[PDB]
Amino acid sequence: MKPKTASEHRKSSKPIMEKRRRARINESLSQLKTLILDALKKDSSRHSKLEKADILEMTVKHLRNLQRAQ
Amino acid sequence: MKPKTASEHRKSSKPIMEKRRRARINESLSQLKTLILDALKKDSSRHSKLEKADILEMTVKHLRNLQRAQ
């Protein structure tokens, strides 16, 4: 399937804290993708083809759209 | 017992494409934190220490603001 890919870049310190961080990274990215795709209402297929980079920048680009809708 | 369910990488993609994606991930996330922190002007000092999760969330939360404050 295509699960929530975790971008594991190793930078350890506190095993517990970095895991909590990691979890929260997924938590935030998941809702990020969710509210973005829902606000723009692009397509569900291009949601099922959302590359991590596509998701991140989509959020930033929507930011610009909102930021001009003042 | 020890249930080994996650040890090997069940991960499939092209090394080159995923590397290109990786670059864009970092690119997107970088400008993402930038425009968010600067738009609300929280603190640029604490901006030197933003947890990845804090960064994603900060952007999502600002999305909400943009969606409902105007």
Curated annotation (Swiss-Prot), chains A, B:
This is Transcription factor HES-1. The chain holds residues 27 to 95 of 280 of the full protein. (Microbial infection) Ubiquitinated via human cytomegalovirus/HCMV protein IE1 that assembles a HES1 ubiquitination complex; leading to HES1 proteasomal degradation. Transcription repression requires formation of a complex with a corepressor protein of the Groucho/TLE family. Interacts (via WPRW motif) with TLE1, and more weakly with TLE2. Interacts with HES6. Interacts with SIRT1. Interacts with an FA complex, composed of FANCA, FANCF, FANCG and FANCL, but not of FANCC, nor FANCE. It comes from the Eukaryota. Residues 2-10 have a biased composition (Basic and acidic residues). Residues 9-66 form the bHLH domain. It is found in: Nucleus. Disulfide bonds: none annotated. Has a particular type of basic domain (presence of a helix-interrupting proline) that binds to the N-box (CACNAG), rather than the canonical E-box (CANNTG). Transcriptional repressor of genes that require a bHLH protein for their transcription. May act as a negative regulator of myogenesis by inhibiting the functions of MYOD1 and ASH1. Binds DNA on N-box motifs: 5'-CACNAG-3' with high affinity and on E-box motifs: 5'-CANNTG-3' with low affinity. May play a role in a functional FA core complex response to DNA cross-link damage, being required for the stability and nuclear localization of FA core complex proteins, as well as for FANCD2 monoubiquitination in response to DNA damage. It comes from Homo sapiens.
